[PDB]
Amino acid sequence: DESAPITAEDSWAVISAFFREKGLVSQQLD
Amino acid sequence: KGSRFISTLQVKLYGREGSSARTIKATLPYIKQDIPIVIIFRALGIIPDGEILEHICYDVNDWQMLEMLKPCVEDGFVIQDRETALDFIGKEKRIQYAKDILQKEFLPHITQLEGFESRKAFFLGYMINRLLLCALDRKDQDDRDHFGKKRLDLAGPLLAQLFKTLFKKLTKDIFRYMQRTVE
Amino acid sequence: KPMVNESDGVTHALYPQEARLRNLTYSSGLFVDVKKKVFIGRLPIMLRSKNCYLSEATESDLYKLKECP
Amino acid sequence: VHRNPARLMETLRTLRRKGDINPEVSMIRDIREKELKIFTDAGRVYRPLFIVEDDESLGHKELKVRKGHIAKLMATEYQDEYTWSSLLNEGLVEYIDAEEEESILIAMQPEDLEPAEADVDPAKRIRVSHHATTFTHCEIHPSMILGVAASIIPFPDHNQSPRNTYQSAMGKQAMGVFLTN
Amino acid sequence: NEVFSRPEWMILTCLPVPPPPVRPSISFNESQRGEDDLTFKLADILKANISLETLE
Amino acid sequence: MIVPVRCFSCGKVVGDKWESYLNLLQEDELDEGTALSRLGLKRYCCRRMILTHVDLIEKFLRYNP
Amino acid sequence: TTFRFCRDCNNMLYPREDKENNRLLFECRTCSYVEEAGSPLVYRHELITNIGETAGVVQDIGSDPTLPRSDRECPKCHSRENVFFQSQQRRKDTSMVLFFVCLSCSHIFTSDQKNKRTQ
Amino acid sequence: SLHKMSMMAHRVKVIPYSTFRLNLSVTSPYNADFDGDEMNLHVPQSEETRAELSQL
Amino acid sequence: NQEDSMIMNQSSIDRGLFRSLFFRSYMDQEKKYGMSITETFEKPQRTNTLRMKHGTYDKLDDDGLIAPGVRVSGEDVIIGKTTPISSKRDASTPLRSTENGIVDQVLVTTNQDGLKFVKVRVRTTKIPQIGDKF
Amino acid sequence: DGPTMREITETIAEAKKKVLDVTKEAQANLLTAKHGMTLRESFEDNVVRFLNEARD
Amino acid sequence: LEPGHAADQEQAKLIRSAIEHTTLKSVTIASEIYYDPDPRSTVIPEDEEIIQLHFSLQQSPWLLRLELDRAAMNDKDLTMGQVGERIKQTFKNDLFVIWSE
Amino acid sequence: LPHFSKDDYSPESKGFVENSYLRGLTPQEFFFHAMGGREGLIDTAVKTAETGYIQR
RNA sequence: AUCGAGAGGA
DNA sequence: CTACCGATAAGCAGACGATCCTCTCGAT
DNA sequence: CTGCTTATCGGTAG
Ligand SMILES: [Mg+2]
Ligand SMILES: [Mg+2]
Ligand SMILES: [Zn+2]
Ligand SMILES: [Zn+2]
Numbered sequence A: 001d002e003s004a005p006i007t008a009e010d011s012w013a014v015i016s017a018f019f020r021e022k023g024l025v026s027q028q029l030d
Numbered sequence B: 001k002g003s004r005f006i007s008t009l010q011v012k013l014y015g016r017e018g019s020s021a022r023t024i025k026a027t028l029p030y031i032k033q034d035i036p037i038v039i040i041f042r043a044l045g046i047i048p049d050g051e052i053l054e055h056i057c058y059d060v061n062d063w064q065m066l067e068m069l070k071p072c073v074e075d076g077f078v079i080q081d082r083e084t085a086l087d088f089i090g091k092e093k094r095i096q097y098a099k100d101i102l103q104k105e106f107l108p109h110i111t112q113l114e115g116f117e118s119r120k121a122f123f124l125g126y127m128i129n130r131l132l133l134c135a136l137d138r139k140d141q142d143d144r145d146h147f148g149k150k151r152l153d154l155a156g157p158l159l160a161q162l163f164k165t166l167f168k169k170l171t172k173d174i175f176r177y178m179q180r181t182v183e
Numbered sequence C: 001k002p003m004v005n006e007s008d009g010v011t012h013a014l015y016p017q018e019a020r021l022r023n024l025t026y027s028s029g030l031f032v033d034v035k036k037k038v039f040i041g042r043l044p045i046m047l048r049s050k051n052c053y054l055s056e057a058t059e060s061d062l063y064k065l066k067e068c069p
Numbered sequence D: 001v002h003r004n005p006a007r008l009m010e011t012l013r014t015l016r017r018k019g020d021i022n023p024e025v026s027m028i029r030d031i032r033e034k035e036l037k038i039f040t041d042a043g044r045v046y047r048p049l050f051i052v053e054d055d056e057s058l059g060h061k062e063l064k065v066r067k068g069h070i071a072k073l074m075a076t077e078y079q080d081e082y083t084w085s086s087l088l089n090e091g092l093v094e095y096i097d098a099e100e101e102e103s104i105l106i107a108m109q110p111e112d113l114e115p116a117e118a119d120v121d122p123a124k125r126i127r128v129s130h131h132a133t134t135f136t137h138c139e140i141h142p143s144m145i146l147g148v149a150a151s152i153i154p155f156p157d158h159n160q161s162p163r164n165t166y167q168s169a170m171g172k173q174a175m176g177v178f179l180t181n
Numbered sequence E: 001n002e003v004f005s006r007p008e009w010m011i012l013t014c015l016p017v018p019p020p021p022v023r024p025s026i027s028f029n030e031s032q033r034g035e036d037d038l039t040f041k042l043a044d045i046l047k048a049n050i051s052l053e054t055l056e
Numbered sequence F: 001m002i003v004p005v006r007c008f009s010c011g012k013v014v015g016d017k018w019e020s021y022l023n024l025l026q027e028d029e030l031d032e033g034t035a036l037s038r039l040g041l042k043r044y045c046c047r048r049m050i051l052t053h054v055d056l057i058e059k060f061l062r063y064n065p
Numbered sequence G: 001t002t003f004r005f006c007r008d009c010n011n012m013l014y015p016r017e018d019k020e021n022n023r024l025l026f027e028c029r030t031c032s033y034v035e036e037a038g039s040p041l042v043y044r045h046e047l048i049t050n051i052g053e054t055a056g057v058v059q060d061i062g063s064d065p066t067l068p069r070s071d072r073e074c075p076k077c078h079s080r081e082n083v084f085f086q087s088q089q090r091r092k093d094t095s096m097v098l099f100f101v102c103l104s105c106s107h108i109f110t111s112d113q114k115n116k117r118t119q
Numbered sequence H: 001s002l003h004k005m006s007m008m009a010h011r012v013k014v015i016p017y018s019t020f021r022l023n024l025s026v027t028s029p030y031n032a033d034f035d036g037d038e039m040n041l042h043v044p045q046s047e048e049t050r051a052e053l054s055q056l
Numbered sequence I: 001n002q003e004d005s006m007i008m009n010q011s012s013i014d015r016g017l018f019r020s021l022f023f024r025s026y027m028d029q030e031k032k033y034g035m036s037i038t039e040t041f042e043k044p045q046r047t048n049t050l051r052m053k054h055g056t057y058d059k060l061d062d063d064g065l066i067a068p069g070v071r072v073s074g075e076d077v078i079i080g081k082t083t084p085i086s087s088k089r090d091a092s093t094p095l096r097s098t099e100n101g102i103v104d105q106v107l108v109t110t111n112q113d114g115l116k117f118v119k120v121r122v123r124t125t126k127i128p129q130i131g132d133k134f
Numbered sequence J: 001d002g003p004t005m006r007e008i009t010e011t012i013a014e015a016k017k018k019v020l021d022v023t024k025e026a027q028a029n030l031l032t033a034k035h036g037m038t039l040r041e042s043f044e045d046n047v048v049r050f051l052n053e054a055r056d
Numbered sequence K: 001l002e003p004g005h006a007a008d009q010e011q012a013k014l015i016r017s018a019i020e021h022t023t024l025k026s027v028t029i030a031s032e033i034y035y036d037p038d039p040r041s042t043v044i045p046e047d048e049e050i051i052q053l054h055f056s057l058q059q060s061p062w063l064l065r066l067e068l069d070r071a072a073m074n075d076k077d078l079t080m081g082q083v084g085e086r087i088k089q090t091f092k093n094d095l096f097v098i099w100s101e
Numbered sequence L: 001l002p003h004f005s006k007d008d009y010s011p012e013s014k015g016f017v018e019n020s021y022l023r024g025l026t027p028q029e030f031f032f033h034a035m036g037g038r039e040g041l042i043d044t045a046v047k048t049a050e051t052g053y054i055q056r
Numbered sequence M: 001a002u003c004g005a006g007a008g009g010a
Numbered sequence N: 001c002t003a004c005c006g007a008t009a010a011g012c013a014g015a016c017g018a019t020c021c022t023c024t025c026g027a028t
Numbered sequence O: 001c002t003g004c005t006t007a008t009c010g011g012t013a014g
Helices: A011-020 B037-043 B051-056 B063-076 B082-088 B093-104 B118-133 B155-167 C016-022 C059-065 D005-017 D067-072 D084-089 D161-173 E037-053 F018-026 F032-039 F044-052 F057-061 G059-063 H024-030 H047-055 I010-014 J002-027 J039-055 K009-019 K080-088 L027-054
Strands: B025-027 B034-036 C003-005 C011-013 C027-032 C038-044 D026-030 D035-039 G013-018 G023-028 G034-036 G084-086 G098-101 G108-110 I020-028 I071-073 I081-084 I088-090 I100-111 I115-126 K028-032 K065-068
Touching (some): A011 D084, B025 B037, B034 B037, B037 B063, B037 B093, B037 B118, B051 B063, B051 B118, B063 B118, B155 C038, C003 C027, C016 I100, D005 D026, D161 L027, F018 F032, F032 F044, I020 I100, J002 J039
Antiparallel strands (some): C027 C038, D026 D035, G023 G034, G084 G098, I020 I115, I071 I100, I100 I115, K028 K065
């Protein structure tokens, strides 16, 4: 159900998300 | 954007608690010694005892502070002008000298161009205003260990400070097969 | 994209994995278009940067260039 | 200088978070010393961090993010077009540094940090309260305060503080596979 | 001390020279060369010292 | 880097059980836990052996020559 | 000590003496402008200060979220909305006291039962 | 080496494997532990010397 | 297993725990600014020069490079090269004083300048022994 | 012991209330300073004391 | 302590405050300067008493006026006069000098 | 930290870990507890020298 | 082998 | 009343740092 | 978290 809030668990996806898009060394490339 | 020329301005509050009359001075690039502010303020055009305090104290119920500056004012109605503030700093050869330093190395960010004098007065007010907030204990010492007022220099920026340093060489060894070409 | 000029020779394409073996430098060429097209040095390349050919590279493409993914 | 710097930030903020001013840039309004600092410098560190604005209709202060988004972002897990970055831009998430952290209120878990106030399995640890109603961005997950090496320790909370720091110099002296090739 | 130490001594005249043992050589080498740092400053010196036997 | 033949702690051959086990998982749609028990592993020195063996070789065949 | 500068040169003026009709006499070494006394007051010190307690109190105050919030009344304005914090002077020797600023009459009020105050 | 104790004569025992081996209870004075600490030995060369060590 | 030692199932080592690999490589090039002084990989003997190493050479073929499955150990010469000064000065790298293993792989290439280049790895398996850390 | 974790706990719990109180006391100009120390030093000192004693 | 003077839980105090260094400043709230040229009377309401009263068992117009805290006056083994006669003895005759009781 | 209101002198806030190495610490506990011996770690590698100079 | 920079073990 | 000498106070500058250890990179 | 040097001031002698 779309609107509704999140829970803890769910944040690991968000992390996931970051990391795929930057990886472990961004800082150096960037 | 544009060098690494490093350029340290200080505003010291000479005078300990009570020790006579707490005068303010400051410091500058290629210089002999210090300077009461009042001058320098005179020197950026800012002249009237008080058209300065505005530059520094920002509200007029603050006597306390005000007063705190009262003895600086005094260190200069030995100088009531713009050209003799420039003065204080070694004629026409040395006034230049100072309308320099107060564009060329007295607070360089801001700018180094011509006219950008009050831009700085003001700042130097600022400075001074935190310099007194902090001696009147209404504000706290500045923390030297806030990650926030530090950076990291990554590879970029470093490749970068050599690159300018050699690109500076090829650059001018060449102002030399060139001097020796004539042809 | 990085190259390299072996004495008495062509300009090779340069591959990280290769330089690592022969002590060469994954670095690339420096060209400026100076007024009145011209090179003045090379410039060591940050692997997996915008030039490093490994920046666009597929998995399978890596192993291929012998490079851990 | 600026009068009504309020109506300005807002604006600022909608603009970094819409994407029209860079998301790097930091953007600090101190209220009470009446500065407003804007910093674009380079070398500053910064991050997590997700966002909160009361931005709710049917009740109270919330996270903007939502099972909605999260769930399209997962979306993009089994398809292996929702990227972190689009979180950035649809504003769920912001980057903070140091300086700017000073003027917020972060929440920890976001859960059991803002569902309203209404037994205790005696073995759970002891959390504090909720005391705060202000939040403006809630932490992504606490574990990230850690870095590459400790992130590897089974449980370091139950664990004395320098020890953990020693395993973290050792972890790097472990043997194994450094690279497929 | 009259015999062992004397202000004039305290200043230089004539400077010993230390033989090899104290400061040798070699290198990667052979046929090329070479040396410690007294041998090189132990020149700088017999260096400008001949610039001055050549003014006078 | 390949399953091991025999569990460290204990003795028992296992190496002959790797493929069998990816097969119960992947294919009769089962929890490693079962699988395991079902391939005969009952001690956890021995469970441990398989639940980890991590098959990096699968990746170094990935390079060519 | 609120003093005062010349009109005519915006500078600073100083003080002498009405010898002669006994009274006070401030005055510029900028022009010759002159004034009758504000008040005889002329120098204040304070070493124990209350002039920094409230500090930046500012309509915006109410939104700054670092500011904790209490359960009180303000006494003119009746609400439960405020926001408090310890005296801003950053003296070592200072009152662990609170100050509140109500939210709807920007009213400022205190935690303290001994010391008397107006600010 | 802060004490006499960090020094001290022993009595040799050759054995297989490659670690100096010691007694726990000679631990403090050296203040070793065994997750790594490493330790040196020296060997006297004169019949005296030897005395010196076994005696003193 | 005291004062933080620990005790290890030697049977389970044997079955494989905790083992590793262990390779190392060694390296080599020819000459500096010679027009007439150029090192040369070879497998040496004397020639008028005769400092040459105390250890053995007989594992190197002509090229002056061991071969792969050969086991080296001790002070063995792994790479023969010589450097001719006026003449045949040995100059040649042996396996570490302490180390023993096996050749794994050997490489031959070259540098920017057309230079001869060589890198020899040796490999050894190391097993949990007594004094090791964990 | 289960009912020790219930004592233990509450045990910290009454020190939470003393810190509190003293804090409240203090905020009220009430709290008294300790010959030669800042009244703020005495608030700190009381608390730190109250909780070490709790840990204890 | 002295030998029998061992627990004059009181005799300790003296010592304290027999020893314990201690500036004007420590007690002084605020220090000020009015032009009150009129010896015989003040400008300031708050001072008026303090005027009927200095003559029972020259001067300038410029009054230095220190205020004292209620406090340090309790914390310290403390007396106006004490203050006073302190102030007066430093200076003897070169300053003229008075207080509230 | 910034998860905390300002002007807060309460316990939590001020580095009072309340749980045990067993049930476990929370975020702030951890982080605080981390300033713990970094201080420690530090002076240690600092005792260690002050010390060994003494000793010399 | 000298020499200078960093990394690591107690 | 002046000058010289002596004493006291303030301001400015200098050298040390755990032991022992293995190893890696680079250069006239 | 100082020992040494320089400068300034109060004292004594001429
Ligand atoms: Mg140890
Ligand atoms: Mg140990
Ligand atoms: Zn088993
Ligand atoms: Zn005027």
